[PDB]
Design a protein around this ligand. Structure first.
Ligand SMILES: Nc1nccc2c(S(=O)(=O)N3CCCNCC3)cccc12
Length: 338
């Protein structure tokens, strides 16, 4: 009953914000630009400092014209509407959002420890306890999100940031969506796509549990289970129903992964009658105190090395380009609700 009542309150609070989203809660000239943290085909993320409070934030800047061209309108509206409505210890906090003639802006808490991906590649692989600590946070986060009828659809190490306490902050809700039943959009990252996405089926939250299998495998092995030079070769491996495990994997880990990386979605853990509890009760998680993880009382495998809330040493270097704002409004109709 404790979990039932927790999730009932979580849904109530989410729905109130979902039905009345916040809008236009800061403006660009409230901030100083520090450094570019990441860059993509329709936006980038910049470390900024608020000029009045001195607080640092990660400001995601999306170019409206490029969002339209790349057919991401609904997705960017989803991202902001969801991010402003959720509240969970392992979900990045959206502090402000606004738009101008050219861009959409999402101003999040800056997570200074860097991507999980960087740390994974620097150490090679994570031990099973280390992988399990991160995996447990994802399990709880998906329990939360799925209970709100949300599917995440972008799980991968580059989207999981390590915070000052060594815990995960999930970022990038660009593919997150409120879905009762099935959805159909082809989106994600090749190595992490569930078979039913590749096969153009109507799919559900089971794709997130498949992606958790991929993530756990990649954390524990150092490389993902299905890889190849060309996406088509990756997809052939994904749909095949075959996966090979390193001999160093424990039997418990292999068993959990066979059930998450189950090609038949009707047999996949997280999508059966027992829901998330088939995962939470699996022997690989027998040492996990789920409540202690949620309360952030477990000592982390490592604390990232950084000097202060403005330190960018755990992130990499990108060309510093202008934030130009057109003198004419672009795509005003499409982004009215943002
Ligand atoms: N709150 C954040 N704090 C640091 C960085 C953040 C980023 S980010 O793009 O800079 N980042 C690293 C490069 C691209 N991969 C995705 C994660 C994205 C979203 C939120 C962030």
């Amino acid at each position: 009953e404790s979990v039932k009542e927790f999730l009932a309150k979580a849904k109530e609070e989410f729905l109130k914000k979902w039905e009345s989203p916040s809008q236009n809660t800061a403006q660009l000239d409230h901030f100083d630009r520090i450094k570019t943290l990441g860059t993509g085909s329709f936006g980038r993320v910049m470390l900024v400092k608020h000029k009045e409070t001195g607080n640092h934030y990660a400001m995601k800047i999306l170019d409206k014209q490029k969002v339209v061209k790349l057919k991401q309108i609904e997705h960017t509206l989803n991202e902001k509407r969801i991010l402003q409505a959720v509240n969970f210890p392992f979900l990045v906090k959206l502090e402000f959002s606004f738009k101008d003639n050219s861009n959409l802006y999402m101003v999040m808490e800056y997570v200074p420890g860097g991507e999980m991906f960087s740390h994974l590649r620097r150490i090679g692989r994570f031990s099973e306890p280390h992988a399990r600590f991160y995996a447990a946070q994802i399990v709880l986060t998906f329990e939360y999100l799925h209970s709100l009828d949300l599917i995440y659809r972008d799980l991968k190490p580059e989207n999981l940031l390590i915070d000052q306490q060594g815990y995960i902050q999930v970022t990038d809700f660009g593919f997150a969506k409120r879905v009762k039943g099935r959805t159909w959009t082809l989106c994600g990252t090749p190595e992490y796509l569930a078979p039913e996405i590749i096969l153009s089926k109507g799919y559900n939250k089971a794709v997130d549990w498949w992606a958790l299998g991929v993530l756990i495998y990649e954390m524990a092995a150092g490389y993902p289970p299905f890889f190849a030079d060309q996406p088509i070769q990756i997809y052939e491996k994904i749909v095949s129903g075959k996966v090979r495990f390193p001999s160093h994997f424990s039997s418990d880990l292999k068993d959990l992964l066979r059930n998450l990386l189950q090609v038949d979605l009707t047999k996949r853990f997280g999508n059966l009658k027992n829901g998330v509890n088939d995962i939470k009760n699996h022997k690989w998680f027998a040492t996990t105190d789920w409540i202690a993880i949620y309360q952030r009382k477990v000592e982390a495998p490592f604390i990232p090395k950084f000097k202060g809330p403005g330190d960018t040493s755990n992130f990499d270097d990108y060309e510093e380009e202008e934030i130009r704002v057109s003198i004419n409004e672009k795509c005003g109709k499409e982004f009215t609700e943002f």
